[PDB]
Structures are given as structure tokens and as C-alpha cells.
Design brief:
It is classed as hydrolase. The entry lists the keywords hydrolase, HAD superfamily. It forms a tetrameric assembly. The structure is a homotetramer. The first copy, chain A, has about 170 residues and is an alpha/beta fold. Chains in contact: A-B, A-D, B-C, C-D. Chains C and D meet through strand 3, helix 2 and helix 3 of C and strand 2 of D. The structure holds 3-deoxy-alpha-D-manno-oct-2-ulopyranosonic acid (KDO) (4 copies) and magnesium ion (7 copies). One 3-deoxy-alpha-D-manno-oct-2-ulopyranosonic acid sits at the interface of chains C and B.
Chain lengths: ~170, ~170, ~170, ~170
């Protein structure tokens, strides 16, 4: 039952995300001119702005590093962009310190092994259906939609509903 | 039963479309050289020309903005291209005024929250299986095929059949 | 039962293909620098070389036109490349005349309305699961695998088996 | 039962991979500027580093040839990169000789006909669900996940478990 999850999302002040496998579907794409490509999902962007609008801080913590991530983050107002960092919990804890925020007030979503401890230790830990078993085992919630296909949108809506901000947001479009 | 839907599509003079999640599958794609990519579906193009051929005006109303949209629109003869606009109903109403057309004569298709009011208020409102629930709740029809996979083709065929123009079009290929 | 289909593929001398929706999955892809992209399937290439090796002539007949098609055709030895042509039967008949070949000796595969007559009139006509109903209605065979996912590979294997050339080809890899 | 497979992976010293259809999902992608694209999977990379970390040598043997393969191989420490080579067994045997290693100590994964003999003859032979039947017929194991979607990750985990290295690796993330 969902109230158990709303209980966890209730006091989130910060939402941090892994990129590959969460914000994208995990494809790493190269071309013959040395150029790299990453694909994001349009409904995730709108869900992230909703969350962000309700006064939640958005962050990226990713093991890889690219201009694509920076660009996607900039247009959605994901305001703390940590790249080239696979020690996710350490990075999260570091953010917690510079914002004056507790881990219990952090939500984190990841698909693989570097994310497991951040997923486990955050107030609200999320993984995805194609997440590795070990990270899923340790999460508070597993999305229905998959990474780069509205897993993020889904969690945004969930946090909004827990904080009584979803229905009002919806209403602005009706 | 389908006649209920044909009753609604019967008097459409204008078909307006959201892009992301409707004409594409919702992927937003960036590369390391700062270049953006969007993917469309080939069967949608042919369905749009069929509609267009039968004397329906084609329009795009999209929250984002790109040369890809302009190019795709130009080759199919989507003749009114409104980009960087998320207030879809306002944009639709504006078109209705410059063409001398009523909303009841507009069909509109969208996948997410900015489209809900245009979907609700148009004579024929359409969403897609991966559309947000709120927009689907308010639509006259939900396509079987998904966005960027022939949702548009499907609605083109539907409007054509309602206007007794489909079978004749087909016949030109037989 | 399959022998009915082998009876039709038995005397094929030429295999002609539509591109979009057959050799690709139907995605039409543009980027912000004005560049177009198309995706093909690796197993189709090998199946086409097998067919080609057994002495069947390979041709493309496509409504659109691009350097991608030319390049893909060149590496597989698809030797007649007709682009910017939607009148597929006329184009096929034209090929039949310059090679001294009958239509009954042509196999053709297509997904949409411009292909229906070529599919109907060729000795062996093929469509795909996501083909429009009208073209599927008129085909001798509908592949199990979808376009850009081994529909072509599948038909190559089928023609090879009808001509007693498949098992031998396989054997060269064992 | 899985122990039968662990018995085969038990003594692997080298893991060799086909690229197209294994490391990618088989898409061959061209653009209008003459540029080629290939997509890899993020979870495969991490599984390959795990394997590699446990002291297994990683190799690529692919029929095609591109800078994308070289780049992907370089970042994961796939250390022997054989491209433009479809005679996979010969290439594998050649590697076996320059490293002083037996075939029984080689694991190989491939999706199509050029890989069948390497798959058959290696100590541990793997194919994928969308592999051609002939190669699947001759393999010791068929992955559950498909190519470019974690088939490789899956086999990495399997070899690790057979060599009692998986649980320990996992533990470093807990
Ligand atoms: O993914 C996006 O960029 C996003 O979802 C953000 C929204 O604010 C909005 O601009 C939306 C468009 O309506 C989609 O066309 O795109
Ligand atoms: O998507 C297209 O551009 C379209 O469907 C439009 C049609 O008019 C026709 O040109 C078609 C081609 O037959 C597809 O190869 O492409
Ligand atoms: O799609 C290809 O280019 C093809 O299937 C053609 C084959 O001849 C062969 O070169 C094959 C490679 O073995 C795939 O890596 O690619
Ligand atoms: O595919 C990758 O490059 C890989 O899986 C390799 C890992 O070592 C790690 O860097 C991982 C990132 O954590 C994914 O963001 O990427
Ligand atoms: Mg990840
Ligand atoms: Mg691409
Ligand atoms: Mg793609
Ligand atoms: Mg949209
Ligand atoms: Mg086609
Ligand atoms: Mg691209
Ligand atoms: Mg292969």
C-alpha cells in the first residue's frame, strides 16, 4: 500500500538522480567523428519542473561525464551537477553538508551497483525495473515505468502526492 | 463503438498536433557537439498527407522549439508551426481566429499536461497510451498505437473514415 | 503450411525492397545541424549477402532519398537503387525490362500503401507485422520479425530454403 | 540447472565478444554527413570491468570495423580488439596462441553465423535470444537479456559466480 511510501517521501527536500539507466535508458552512444549521444525523456522534464516548483532541490550524481548531462540539467534547473563520480553516497552526503540538509531529507534514484548505498541510506531510495537486483533489494520503491521512459516522472508525481502538491499542480492545467 | 467517434471527427477542418510524445516517442536527444536530435515515424507522414489532401489544415503546437520540427513540418505540409508555446488551447484558439474556424472544427492530439485543455476543449480531442492520465481522462479517443509509432497515422485514418475519404484514398494505391 | 510459400519463392531471380519500415523500423531522424539519420539491422545484411551469393539480384525501391540508403546498398551489393520513387510497381516493371526478367520472378517487400500493388503483383509479395492492413491483405507472406529487426533476414532465409540454398550456406559456417 | 554452466565457466581466462547484436542491439546507423553510429549498454560496461578486475582478459572479435568499437573497448579495458574479421574461431585461436591459453579457457559470445564455430569450440560458448538458431543450437548458454540490453552484463555475472568472485565484488558496493 502506497501510504507507506508517502510516509518516506513526506519530508524530502532534495531529489538526486543517477543519469545512465534512470534519466536515459542506459544506451551509451558513439559516432565515427568521436561524438557522444544520450537520450532523455520529455515527460521526465515536466515532472522534474513540477517537483522543483514545489521547492525541492534537484541534483545529478553520475559516474560518467558529458556536455549532454550539463545541458539537460541546465534546462530543467537541476542545480547541482556532480559528474565523473561513482561514489554516490559520499557525493550525496557532501551535498547534504553544503545545503544544511539531512540524508533523511534526500531522495535518491539509481539503477546499478554504485548507487546501492545511496539508495539504501537516503530517506527515500528508489530503483527501476531494469535495476540490478542488489540495488532493487535495498530500495524503498521500484518504479513501474523504466529508465528514460518515465521512471523519473513517476517518482516526481509520487513525491508531489506525498507532499500534497500534485493535485494543485495538475489543477493549473485544467 | 466507433460511430460515436466518427460523429466527433465528422466536421474537422483543422488537425493540430503536439510534437514530443505524439509525433516522436518522447525522446529528447543531445550530443557532445551541442547538437539535438528528434525521431519521427514514416507512416505518420503518409497519413498526414492523406488528411491534408482531403482538405484538412495541419498545424503543430509544441512547448519546445527546433529546426527538426520545422523541417518535418515543411516536408509534410504542416502549414502552421507554433513552437516554444506550452499554452496549447490559447494557441489553438488563435489559429481558429486567423483561419475563421470554430474549435468544434479543430482536432487536437497531445500526450501531457500542457495539452489537456486543448484536448478537452477541441471538437475532437485525442491522446495516446503513454499519455498522462489527466489528459487521457479528458480525451474523446485514445489511440491504440503509441507516439512516434503510428498514433498520428491512426488518427489520420480515423478522421478520413469519418469524412468518407479513406476508402477512396486507399483505392488510389490499388 | 510453408511449402505453399516455397512454391512462390521457388523461381525468384530478383529481390526488391522498400527501405523505410522494412530495412529500417520506420524512424525518420533529423538533427539541429540539418543532418538525417537512418538505422539498419546487422542480421539483414548477412541474409542479403546469402541471397545475393546464391545468384539473386538485389534492388531498392524507396519513396524517399538519402546517402544513407546508397551507402547501405553499396556495402551489401544491392545493385539497383531506385530512390525518390513511390510508384513501386512501375519501378519494378522497369527493372524487369532492363534485366530481361518476368514479374513472377520478382520478390517484393513493403510496409505501406505505395508498395501494395508491387506486393500484390510480384511473384512473391511480402509485408511485415506493422505493415498497413491493405498491403498485408494482398501479400503472400507476412514476416514474423518486424522491419529493421530481421524481417529481411527472415525473407532471405525463406527464399534460400525454397531454392535449396540455405542448408548449404549454413554449412559453410559449421 | 545452473551448476552445469558454472562447471563450464569455472576455468575461463579470456572472454571474447562479438560486437553487433551482442554489445549493441544490432542497429547499424548512418547519417547524411557520412557518419556512423553504434549504441552500447551502460550495465555491460560495469559487468565487463568486474570480470576484468577478477583477472579475466577481454577481447573483441567483430566482422565490421569502426572508431566506436575502439573507443568503447579502450574505456572498459577490452585489451585485444580484432575488427574487420568474420573468421571468429581462427581469430580466437590466434589470441589463444599469443597469450599461451587453451580454447577450453576461452569464453565466447556471438549472435550470428560467423560466430557459430567460435561459440561451439570455446570452453564456454554463449548466444542471445535474438541469435540465429544455428548458433543458439551450438551454445552452452543463451542469455535471458538481449544484445545491447545486458546480455553481456549477465554473462559477466555468470562467470564471476562460477569463479567465486561475484559476491565479493557486490560486497564492495555495500
Ligand atoms: O522535457 C522537457 O524539456 C519538457 O518536458 C519540459 C517542460 O517544461 C515542457 O517545456 C515540455 C514540452 O511541453 C514538451 O514539448 O518539455
Ligand atoms: O514520412 C514520410 O516522409 C513519408 O511517409 C511521406 C510519404 O509521402 C512518402 O514520401 C513516404 C515514403 O514512401 C517512405 O519511404 O514517406
Ligand atoms: O550488416 C552487415 O553489414 C553485416 O551483417 C554483413 C556481413 O557480411 C558481416 O560483415 C556482418 C558482421 O559480421 C557483423 O559484425 O555485418
Ligand atoms: O558503461 C560504462 O561506461 C560504465 O558502466 C562503466 C562503469 O565503470 C561506470 O563508470 C559506469 C557509470 O557508473 C554509469 O554512469 O559506466
Ligand atoms: Mg546508472
Ligand atoms: Mg540516434
Ligand atoms: Mg534509438
Ligand atoms: Mg508532448
Ligand atoms: Mg516503407
Ligand atoms: Mg544520432
Ligand atoms: Mg554479431
Amino acid at each position: 500500500h502506497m501510504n507507506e511510501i508517502y510516509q518516506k517521501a513526506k519530508h524530502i527536500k532534495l531529489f538526486a538522480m543517477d543519469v545512465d539507466g534512470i534519466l536515459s535508458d542506459g544506451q551509451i552512444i558513439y559516432n565515427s567523428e568521436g561524438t557522444e549521444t544520450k537520450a532523455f525523456y520529455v515527460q521526465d522534464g515536466l515532472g522534474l519542473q513540477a517537483l522543483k516548483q514545489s521547492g525541492i532541490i534537484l541534483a545529478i550524481i553520475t559516474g560518467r561525464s558529458s556536455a549532454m548531462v550539463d545541458r539537460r540539467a541546465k534546462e530543467l534547473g537541476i542545480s547541482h551537477i556532480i559528474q565523473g563520480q561513482d561514489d554516490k553516497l559520499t557525493a550525496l552526503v557532501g551535498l547534504t553538508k553544503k545545503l544544511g540538509i539531512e540524508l533523511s531529507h534526500c531522495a535518491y534514484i539509481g539503477d546499478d551497483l554504485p548507487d546501492l548505498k545511496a539508495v539504501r541510506e537516503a530517506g527515500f531510495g528508489i530503483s527501476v525495473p531494469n535495476g540490478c537486483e542488489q540495488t532493487r533489494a535495498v530500495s524503498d520503491y521500484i518504479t513501474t515505468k523504466t529508465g528514460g521512459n518515465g521512471a523519473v516522472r513517476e517518482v516526481c508525481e509520487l513525491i508531489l502526492k506525498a507532499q500534497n502538491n500534485f493535485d494543485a499542480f495538475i489543477a493549473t492545467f485544467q
